[PDB]
Every structure is written in structure tokens, then in C-alpha cells.
Amino acid sequence: TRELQSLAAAVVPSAQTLKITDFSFSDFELSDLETALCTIRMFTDLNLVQNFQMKHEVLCRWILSVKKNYRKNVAYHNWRHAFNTAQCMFAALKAGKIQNKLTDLEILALLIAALSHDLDHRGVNNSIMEHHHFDQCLMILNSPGNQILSGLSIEEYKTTLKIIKQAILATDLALYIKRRGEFFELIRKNQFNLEDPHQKELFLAMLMTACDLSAITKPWPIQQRIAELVATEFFDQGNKIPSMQVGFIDAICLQLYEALTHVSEDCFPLLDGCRKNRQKWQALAEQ
Ligand SMILES: COc1ccc2c3c(c(Cc4ccc(Cl)cc4)[nH]c13)CCNC2=O
Ligand SMILES: [Mg+2]
Numbered sequence: 505t506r507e508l509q510s511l512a513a514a515v516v517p518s519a520q521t522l523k524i525t526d527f528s529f530s531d532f533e534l535s536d537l538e539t540a541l542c543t544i545r546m547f548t549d550l551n552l553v554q555n556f557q558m559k560h561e562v563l564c565r566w567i568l569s570v571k572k573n574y575r576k577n578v579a580y581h582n583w584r585h586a587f588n589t590a591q592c593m594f595a596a597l598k599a600g601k602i603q604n605k606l607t608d609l610e611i612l613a614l615l616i617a618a619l620s621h622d623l624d625h626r627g628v629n630n631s632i633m634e635h636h637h638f639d640q641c642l643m644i645l646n647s648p649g650n651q652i653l654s655g656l657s658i659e660e661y662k663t664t665l666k667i668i669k670q671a672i673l674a675t676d677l678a679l680y681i682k683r684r685g686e687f688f689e690l691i692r693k694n695q696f697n698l699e700d701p702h703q704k705e706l707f708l709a710m711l712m713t714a715c716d717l718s719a720i721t722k723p724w725p726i727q728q729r730i731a732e733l734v735a736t737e738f739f740d741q742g743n744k745i746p747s748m749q750v751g752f753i754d755a756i757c758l759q760l761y762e763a764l765t766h767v768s769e770d771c772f773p774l775l776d777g778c779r780k781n782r783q784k785w786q787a788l789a790e791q
């Protein structure tokens with residue numbers, strides 16, 4: 505309540521002053537309260553606040569519920585990873601100019617899903633998990649005081665909930681590797697068409713995974729610090745890394761950021777940043 509009062513009172517600096525439109529954004533210098541402000545600006549500047557009549561103290565309270573239900577004790581899968589996933593969704597919608605290709609309910613759902621998609625993760629060494637993450641998400645969404653979708657009609661609410669759930673489930677990398685063949689497939693034959701409801705849902709999944717993974721695209725000093733959190737979580741349950749990093753980039757990351765660059769050439773900095781990191785890791789791998 506002490507934290508909610510400060511949060512609700514504060515003025516929310518512009519998207520420019522917060523730097524949330526940059527693919528190279530980083531959160532290391534922000535306090536919990538500042539990521540909260542960044543989050544309101546994301547909602548506000550996607551015009552989700554007015555278009556769905558969100559009340560300020562509810563949105564505020566909803567963000568703090570989401571943040572609280574990530575575990576500070578987990579070195580990487582925590583609020584900051586979720587906050588960063590949402591910042592990249594924001595950036596890809598704005599700077600990557602993907603906003604225009606989607607509808608309001610899709611965008612509302614993507615942002616809620618990005619922020620919620622790992623709720624209550626306890627660490628890799630501790631599609632079962634994603635169903636739990638969605639469960640948390642919905643629970644918080646229904647808590648009185650946090651109900652940021654209350655201004656949506658029942659039909660809007662039902663559509664938005666379905667997309668949210670699909671988007672969070674899509675962050676299972678096993679689901680991503682199962683489905684990306686089809687996605688890459690349609691891009692290489694210039695058959696890709698967002699107006700097909702199946703390809704729309706497919707793209708939304710792939711965009712969720714690209715945001716989820718996007719620490720791998722950051723500028724080298726930021727990305728290397730994220731890598732330390734990953735190594736901490738995976739090893740310490742709390743020489744070999746450069747080749748793992750190259751193996752992960754090749755097996756999981758590069759094609760996705762390549763495909764996404766075809767759907768919108770303004771997402772190229774994610775591909776660019778991924779590429780720079782691969783070469784820098786490769787260099788280290790050769791000792
Ligand atoms: C900047 O790098 C990374 C940024 C983000 C992620 C990841 C992963 C990896 C692979 C890995 C795992 C353990 C170790 Cl020890 C090394 C390498 N690297 C990542 C999987 C975890 N999901 C991620 O969001
Ligand atoms: Mg996850």
C-alpha cells in the first residue's frame with residue numbers, strides 16, 4: 505500500500521524520456537518503481553488506457569500484483585525478465601512498426617501476456633509450467649482492484665482471454681520448435697498473410713517467442729550481464745559458456761529474428777544485435 509501510493513501519485517515520463525522505444529533498452533539502473541512507471545507508459549502509449557477505460561489505481565495495482573508474484577530469489581526468470589519481454593513487445597510494436605498489423609485486442613493481450621508469461625517461475629532447476637503461468641495471470645486479472653479488463657465487453661473479454669492464454673502457452677520453447685517450421689515455411693514462399701486466422705495466431709506466438717528471447721539481441725555489455733544471470737540460474741540453482749551461447753543462438757534464435765525481419769524490416773536491430781553477439785561469442789569460443 506505504501507508502494508501503491510507512491511506509484512499512483514507519480515507523473516509518468518514520456519516514452520522518449522524512459523527510452524522504452526529502443527530495442528537496446530536496458531533495466532539495470534531502474535528501481536522496481538521505475539519499471540512500474542515504464543509499464544504504465546507502455547499501456548498508455550499503446551492507448552490501451554483510454555480504449556478500454558482502465559482506471560489509474562487499478563492499472564497501478566495490477567502491475568504491482570504482477571511484479572510481486574515474480575520471485576526475487578530467481579536469478580533470471582523474474583519480474584525483470586518479464587518487464588524486459590514487455591519492453592521488447594512495446595519496441596517491436598512501435599519502432600518495429602508491428603502495431604498497425606494487429607488489432608487492439610491482440611495488442612492488449614500481447615502486452616498483458618508478455619508481462620504475465622512467467623508469473624511465479626521458481627527457476628529451471630526447481631507444457632506444465634506455462635499453464636501455471638497463465639493460471640497466475642488470470643488469477644491476478646480477476647482479483648478485485650486489479651481488474652484492468654473490466655471495461656471490455658463480455659465478447660471482447662472472451663476474445664482477449666483466449667489470446668492471452670495462447671500467447672503465454674506459446675512461450676514453451678517446445679511449442680516454438682514444433683510450430684516454427686510452418687512459419688519459416690510461409691515466409692520463404694512469400695505466402696505469409698496475417699489475414700488468415702491461423703497465420704495470425706501463428707505470428708502472435710512467434711512474436712511472443714522473439715520478445716521472450718530478446719536479451720540475446722542486446723548490446724554486448726548488456727547481453728553479457730544477462731548471460732551471467734542465466735548461467736547463475738541454470739548452474740548455481742539460485743569456459744564452456746561461449747560455445748553454449750553460439751549453440752543457443754544458431755539452434756533457437758537467429759532464424760526467428762530473420763523471419764521476423766521479413767514481416768517487418770524495422771525489427772532488423774533484433775537480428776543485427778543477435779548477429780553481433782554471435783560473432784563476439786564465437787570469437788571467445790576460439791579461446
Ligand atoms: C543472453 O543469453 C540468454 C538470454 C536469455 C535466455 C537464454 C538462454 C540461454 C542459453 C544458456 C543457458 C544456460 C547457460 Cl549456463 C548458458 C546458456 N541464453 C540466454 C535460455 C534461457 N531463456 C532466455 O531467455
Ligand atoms: Mg517461460
Ligand SMILES: [Zn+2]
Binds near residue numbers: 622675716
Ligand atoms: Zn520467459
